[PDB]
Design a binder for these strands. Structure first.
Ligand code: MG
Ligand code: MG
Ligand code: MG
Ligand code: MG
Ligand code: MG
Ligand code: MG
Ligand code: MG
Ligand code: MG
Ligand code: MG
Ligand code: MG
Ligand code: MG
Lengths: 50, 107, 63, 50, 31, 62
RNA sequence: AGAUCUUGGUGGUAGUAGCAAAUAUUCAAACGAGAACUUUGAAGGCCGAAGUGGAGAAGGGUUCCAUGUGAACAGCAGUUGA
RNA sequence: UCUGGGUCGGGGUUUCGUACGUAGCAGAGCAGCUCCCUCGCUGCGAUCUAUUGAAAGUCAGCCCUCGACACAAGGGUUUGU
């Protein structure tokens, strides 16, 4: 986690056109690899893996 | 080989981080024994009296942060022992710990 | 072996407490044979039993 | 998402990159070096490296 | 006469403790 | 990127760091951490603390 | 079959509560089949002279001191022990 | 495994705040040395300055090493339509 600084684009607010800080959480997201496909089929008992 | 001796240094502060005041030195000796078992494979470990004095030099709670030891894997072939190799650890007094590497020391 | 008797006798002969009495760990077998004060006097003179010095308590800091 | 909080453009003016391992006060290596000048470790490093 | 090896083993026997302890004065066996 | 202030120690204070202190007489001070604030509230001269920037320029260190 | 029946024996509880007042032990060696509790040496501690020291009275009556034992006890163990 | 993980070492980070020793025509002064010196020289002396944002710790539940070291296709118990 860290913090940033940004403007505000909210009219009618006490922070409009003002610099504010905000807490942010960093999530590292490497690209994912797709290695298969499942199909689901609807049943009167729910979705089941076809 | 199976007889050679070596010189190591141990971060006693790292291995005793978290131990209570009245168990820091005995826990240090237990961790030294476990360390001697790790790099040698010999369950039989003998801790020298001078090394024990160096460990207990600053009391029971202020164990020195690092120590410079010398492991020697000698033959236990002096009696009918289950293990034929025993590790004797000694204390090597040093003035500083900077740039100290593990070295294979001859007999 | 056990040298409980010898150390007590050595303290009595040396006229000092058991704290100051030092018995040679190497020659344990020889001391174990000593069972009388007369033998202890021999061992003390022979050096196997040594009276340790009083622990240093300097008054130089006080001075 | 139709509220003004949502679909709101976000533009960052500054991102904090100080040392989280304690109480940081510098953003970059160059900034810290420029503020603190040369140090003993670098002086002896150049002393050995000529 | 006393030589270097005899003094080297005397170095081992003469110490009966750590720093600040006294030194052994004699060790004689007699019957 | 905001208006950057300076502390008791003279260090630069980035936004989202430290605390600001306003006294009864009207003077406003800001600190980088509690250590500077504790030094200031204890009435300790910055020119006698070695790691203070004012000390560094007083003794012309660097 | 009863009587909170008398005596004796055995269960569930249950390998459970617990074995937590007074800082703290550690290394090497010896005997030993066996070592954390025995012993020796070394280190670190405590009691800090109104002491966990050195001696008495009352009281206990052989616990005193040597040698040997690992049947039972020292709520664990013991090569030790009142 | 295109080797892997460790133990040390390094660097980064940060915490505290300038280490011992050495030098000082710095130091309240004091006591000795005066053919001496012509303004001096020898000890005691908390503290102050340079050495020095120095010294020390820094994962044990922080980060990067490709530096050194040794170790790692080894162990035991089972499982069948
Ligand atoms: Mg942090
Ligand atoms: Mg009946
Ligand atoms: Mg009836
Ligand atoms: Mg009844
Ligand atoms: Mg229980
Ligand atoms: Mg208990
Ligand atoms: Mg005391
Ligand atoms: Mg008494
Ligand atoms: Mg008795
Ligand atoms: Mg029992
Ligand atoms: Mg390191």
């Amino acid at each position: 986690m860290t913090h940033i600084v940004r403007e505000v684009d909210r009219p009618g607010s006490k922070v409009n056109k003002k610099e504010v800080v905000e807490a942010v959480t960093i999530v590292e997201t490497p690209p994912m690899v797709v290695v298969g496909i499942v199909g689901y089929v609807e049943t009167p008992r729910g979705l089941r893996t076809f | 080989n199976e007889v050679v001796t070596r010189e190591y240094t141990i971060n006693i502060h790292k291995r005793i981080h978290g131990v209570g005041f009245k168990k820091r030195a005995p826990r240090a000796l237990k961790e030294i024994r476990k360390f001697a078992m790790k790099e040698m494979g010999t369950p039989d470990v003998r801790i020298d009296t001078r090394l024990n004095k160096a460990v207990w030099a600053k009391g029971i709670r202020n164990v020195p942060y690092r120590i410079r030891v010398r492991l020697s894997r000698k033959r236990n072939e002096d009696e009918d022992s289950p293990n034929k190799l025993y590790t004797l650890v000694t204390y090597v007094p040093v003035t500083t710990f900077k740039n100290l590497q593990t070295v294979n020391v001859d007999e | 072996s056990m040298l409980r008797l010898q150390k007590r006798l050595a303290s009595s002969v040396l006229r000092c407490g058991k704290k100051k009495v030092w018995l040679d760990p190497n020659e344990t077998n020889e001391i174990a044979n000593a069972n009388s004060r007369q033998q202890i006097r021999k061992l003390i003179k022979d050096g196997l039993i040594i009276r340790k010095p009083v622990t240093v308590h300097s008054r130089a800091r006080c001075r | 998402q139709t509220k003004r909080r949502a679909l709101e453009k976000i533009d960052l003016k500054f991102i904090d990159t100080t040392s989280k391992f304690g109480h940081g006060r510098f953003q970059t290596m160059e900034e810290k070096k420029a503020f603190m000048g040369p140090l003993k470790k670098d002086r002896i490093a150049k002393e050995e490296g000529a | 006469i006393m030589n270097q090896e005899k003094l080297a083993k005397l170095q081992a026997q003469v110490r009966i403790g750590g720093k600040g302890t006294a030194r052994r004065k004699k060790k004689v066996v007699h019957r | 990127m905001k208006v950057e202030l300076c502390s008791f120690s003279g260090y630069k204070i980035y936004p989202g760091h430290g605390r600001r202190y306003a006294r009864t007489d009207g003077k406003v001070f800001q600190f980088l951490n509690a250590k500077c604030e504790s030094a200031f509230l204890s009435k300790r001269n910055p020119r006698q603390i070695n790691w203070t920037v004012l000390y560094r320029r007083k003794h012309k260190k660097g």
